[PDB]
């Protein structure tokens, strides 16, 4: 692999999704993929559907070979199911081959192709655990590993909020500056890490910190917005109104279903607190804490040329406390799978009006947390 | 899943060896199978794949010509026949599935 040639491999932006380009096939259709760190299957449309363009034809692959059974993935909202074959597949950018992989050609779903979505299919990026039919369904991230003699470890940087980058293989040093700070890998289905605390405006949430990790907190490149179990979604937008300069926000901007508007170049960014999460080092002793600008969670939206308006960029959650793109866009983030960890460095592009809008920091101390903030 | 590598040994260079890895524990019928080698002081490196019903075969280009993947899906094996061996090859072969491998079996080619 070539890591450097991978810089800017990612086109999108926060609330569409980041995708890389993938040639399929023999010879090759080039397809749009959804970078998910949050599922383990490599599926692309496989027929014609509303909201994409395009979608791979098994028919005019000659290397496309069909394993004679179907997958069905549900989600929480959505679902789709696709015939199960295998194909080989190009990434244009950082390597000097093909390579043999897995792929499910969608035929039928529902509330899975989304308005507005520039991609058309998905980049199963987490644990071969979360693979259907089943775990023997080599992940694309595996078989790569495996036939391009890369380590197991792949980083990612969003610069929508500022394209992007994904880095298979390594870590790009021309994407940060300062300290790459490791979180373990708890479990290893999703990114599963051990938020310990969070603080907004300088002030901890007082929450047991179980209640961070009692679902699952785990980091989900495919999740748009910052996903929070409504207990402390609840506890944030106290926080976030309590610490408000002056009061701007109604209870539908912090539900989403209104928009906060400012006439043009009003936007009072200095109103408004940090955010942040407080994670483990690899020594149990220290933590260190991601911390994100209001400018990363009141999020940009199309009131007229004349007003700028915003949505809220975190959101309630049923069944997972998730890192989605809300806050990923001010970090590079490390998948560190054989080290089973997790890195983070504030990403240079998370720059707006001449000013960083996250930052890194730490090493504090863990000695008043529970020694496990995961349900034991 | 049970991966299980058998077949190396030591040989002269010119030589030739059959790997067999016999699977277990998964369908291997609709598995995508891999032959990896590793050597002592050097980096993992990938030998040669095959789809899961044998017509699609991929080659490192160090053993292109001089090697053969092949499956018997009715016997749950994969095989790797290995012809004009070099000092080069010596290593542990392992073949791997879904991020799973087996403990490996020794080729030493030597004079």
């Known amino acids: 692999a070539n890591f450097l040639a991978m810089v800017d491999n990612l086109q999108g932006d926060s609330g569409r999704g980041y995708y890389l380009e993938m040639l399929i096939g023999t010879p090759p259709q080039k397809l749009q993929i959804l970078v998910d760190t949050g599922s383990s299957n490599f599926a692309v449309a496989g027929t014609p559907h509303s909201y994409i363009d395009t979608y791979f034809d098994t028919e005019r692959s000659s290397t496309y070979r069909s394993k004679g059974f179907d997958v069905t993935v549900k989600y929480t909202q959505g679902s789709w199911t696709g015939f199960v074959g295998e194909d080989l597949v190009t990434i244009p950018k950082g390597f000097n081959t093909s390579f043999l992989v897995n792929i499910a050609t969608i035929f039928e779903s529902e509330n899975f192709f989304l308005p507005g979505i520039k991609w058309n299919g998905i980049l199963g990026l987490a644990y071969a655990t979360l693979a259907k039919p089943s775990s023997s369904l080599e992940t694309f991230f595996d078989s790569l590993v495996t036939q391009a003699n890369i380590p197991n470890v792949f980083s990612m940087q969003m610069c929508g909020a500022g394209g992007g980058s994904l880095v298979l293989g390594g870590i790009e040093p021309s994407l940060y500056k300062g300290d790459i700070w490791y979180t373990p890998i708890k479990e290893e289905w999703y990114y599963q890490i051990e938020i310990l605390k969070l603080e907004i405006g300088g002030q901890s949430l007082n929450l047991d910190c179980r209640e961070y990790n009692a679902d699952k907190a785990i980091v989900d490149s495919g999740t748009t917005l910052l996903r929070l179990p409504q207990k402390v979604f609840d506890a944030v937008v106290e926080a976030v109104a309590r610490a408000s300069l002056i009061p701007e926000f109604s209870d539908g901007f912090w539900t989403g279903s209104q928009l906060a508007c400012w006439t043009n170049s009003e936007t009072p960014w200095s109103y408004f607190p940090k955010i942040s999460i407080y994670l483990r080092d690899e020594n149990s002793s220290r933590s260190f804490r991601i911390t994100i600008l209001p400018q990363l969670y009141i999020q940009p939206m199309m009131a007229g040329l004349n007003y700028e308006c915003y949505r809220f960029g975190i959101s309630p959650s049923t069944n997972a406390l998730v890192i989605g793109a809300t806050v990923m866009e001010g970090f590079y983030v490390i998948f560190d799978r054989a080290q089973k960890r997790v890195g983070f460095a504030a990403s240079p592009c998370a720059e707006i009006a001449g000013a960083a809008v996250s930052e890194i920091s730490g090493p504090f101390s863990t000695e008043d947390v529970a020694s496990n903030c995961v349900p034991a | 899943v049970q991966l299980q590598e058998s077949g190396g040994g030591l040989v002269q260079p010119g030589g030739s060896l059959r790997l067999s890895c016999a699977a277990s524990?998964?369908?291997?019928?609709?598995?995508?199978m891999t032959w990896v080698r590793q050597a002592p002081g050097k980096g993992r490196e990938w030998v040669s794949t095959i789809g899961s019903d044998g017509s699609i075969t991929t080659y490192a280009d160090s053993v292109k010509g001089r090697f053969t993947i092949s499956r018997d899906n009715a016997r749950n094996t994969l095989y790797l026949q290995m012809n004009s061996l070099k000092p080069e090859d010596t290593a542990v072969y392992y073949c791997?599935?879904?991020?799973?491998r087996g403990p490996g079996t020794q080729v030493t080619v030597s004079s």
């Open positions: 524990g998964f369908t291997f019928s609709s598995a995508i």
């Open positions: 791997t599935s879904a991020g799973r």
